[PDB]
Amino acid sequence: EDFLGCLVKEIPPRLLYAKSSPAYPSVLGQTIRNSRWSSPDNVKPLYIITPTQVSHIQSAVVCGRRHTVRIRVRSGGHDYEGLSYRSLQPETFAVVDLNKMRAVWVDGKARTAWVDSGAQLGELYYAIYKASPTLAFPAGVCPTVGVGGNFAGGGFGMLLRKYGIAAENVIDVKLVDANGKLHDKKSMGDDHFWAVRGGGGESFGIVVAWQVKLLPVPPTVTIFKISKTVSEGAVDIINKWQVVAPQLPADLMIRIIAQGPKATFEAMYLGTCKTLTPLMSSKFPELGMNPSHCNEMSWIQSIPFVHLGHRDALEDDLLNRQNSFKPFAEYKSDYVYQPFPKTVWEQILNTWLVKPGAGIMIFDPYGATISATPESATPFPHRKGVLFNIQYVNYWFAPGAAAAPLSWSKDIYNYMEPYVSKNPRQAYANYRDIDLGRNEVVNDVSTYASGKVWGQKYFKGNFERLAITKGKVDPTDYFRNEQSIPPLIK
Ligand SMILES: *Cc1cc2c(nc3c(=O)[nH]c(=O)nc-3n2C[C@H](O)[C@H](O)[C@H](O)COP(=O)(O)OP(=O)(O)OC[C@H]2O[C@@H](n3cnc4c(N)ncnc43)[C@H](O)[C@@H]2O)c(*)c1C
Ligand code: NA
Ligand code: NA
Ligand SMILES: [Xe]
Ligand SMILES: [Xe]
After folding, report:
1. Whether residue 142 is found in the same domain as residue 215
2. Which residue has the CA at smallest separation from atom 1 of ligand 5?
3. Residue 293 annotated in ligand binding
4. I want to staple 334 with a disulfide (CB 3.0 to 4.6 A). Which of 63, 147, 318, 390 is the partner?
5. How far is ligand 2, taken at its centre, from the CA of residue 460, in Å?
6. Is the CB of residue 483 less than 8 Å from the CB of residue 432?
7. Is the CB of 200 under 6 A from ligand 5?
8. In CATH, what number is assigned to the domain containing residue 386?
9. Is 260 part of any known ligand binding site?
10. Is Translocase one of the keywords (predicted)?
11. Cis peptide before 424 (omega within 30 of 0)
């Protein structure tokens, strides 16, 4: 009725979709990345708005405030729980979908760029490349991830040891707050600008665009991928890795992927084969690396190479909006501060990763720049002392095959509890996991006590400052979801 009435006064009607609209199913599904959340049993938005101008976003928020219809914002749609376009329980909401606002304006000489939230990471990276072969930006690894959610929740990838997370390399933003007002760094103040850069999506307003500093990379980088089965000595090698990798020079990141009794060591090095080989021989000879393992290429070519194994298809891999990969998926994460006993590595490789519904485990080492930033300097607290992060990933491809992978995910998380961080058990906000806890709503406001349960896991000692900031910029909890920062007020 009147919410829609208000929208049509301010926004071109071709940018508005109701459930009855012919294109609604298509617009809704276009950036859903998880087949668990696309099916008809999921709660759907009442309306979808696809702005092309910032004034459309402002109008949508004003209308929502006036008619008390809450808005969930979607940029790339990768939210692991789908909270950008679905709710867990029946309720009325509109989705503001930013996929049409996708400009990237790079200033090569100043080494800065303005990037719309609706741009995907691959589009950002590709625009940086068109400006310079020796500039980069340290955000996620997956090209179809949206800038908006990736930066809001922190954002890290293969440059994290060198340059930290995306959010700490953001120098300004353009944001629409809960009253429809347009803000930048100057107008929003220290607290709000601190919170929005890593404090998770949705909670602190709709970010329209981000200004980033662009960072130097050499014209040639080197990648290798070396696998070790357990008979090839994987357990002893990974047991050494967990101590060595966090301490390596910042130019060298060695992550691990495991999906059975075999570990694949994937390395990105900001330099040439010529200097890498002696570094490896000196610091990590157990891996058995030699020049035949090296793949030299530009930074921009390393993005599809690391993620997909592709060397030959830059535009197709980075500029892709077909949305073809739509697994059913479950995810969990952990942080590790103390080395695992060799027996735990034996169990993970020989036992947990050879079970029905077993998934994939990805291990990213910290240390260096990401660990040098104080824990409270940004909302992202997983810094000093971190050896590595773990992501537990489960994919399946048929609707009725969820039981086994969901059970595995729960069981291995229980198994790992004694060896990972605790009090709280830390997790990465952008690896969203609703089983960590969800909000309770009382008198139409999310409660501080329910928020704290999962909030301390994502944000540790930063959670209370996030909530106090929330209370100042959005006391009525307009921008929320089931796992958004609750307001903490007078
Ligand atoms: C699907 C997927 C996710 C990945 C992948 N690899 C990652 C990597 O290498 N590094 C990472 O740091 N993260 C990786 N992730 C996780 C993604 O970073 C997260 O899933 C991001 O949150 C996704 O962002 P986006 O694609 O924009 O997802 P949405 O579902 O639109 O939003 C997430 C969340 O944030 C809110 N939000 C969106 N847009 C905005 C704006 N503009 N302002 C404020 N808040 C925003 C949403 O409401 C929602 O709550 C690899 C793959 C394949
Ligand atoms: Na702890
Ligand atoms: Na989940
Ligand atoms: Xe806000
Ligand atoms: Xe969050």
Report:
1. yes
2. 200
3. no
4. 390
5. 9
6. yes
7. yes
8. 3.40.462.20
9. no
10. no
11. yes
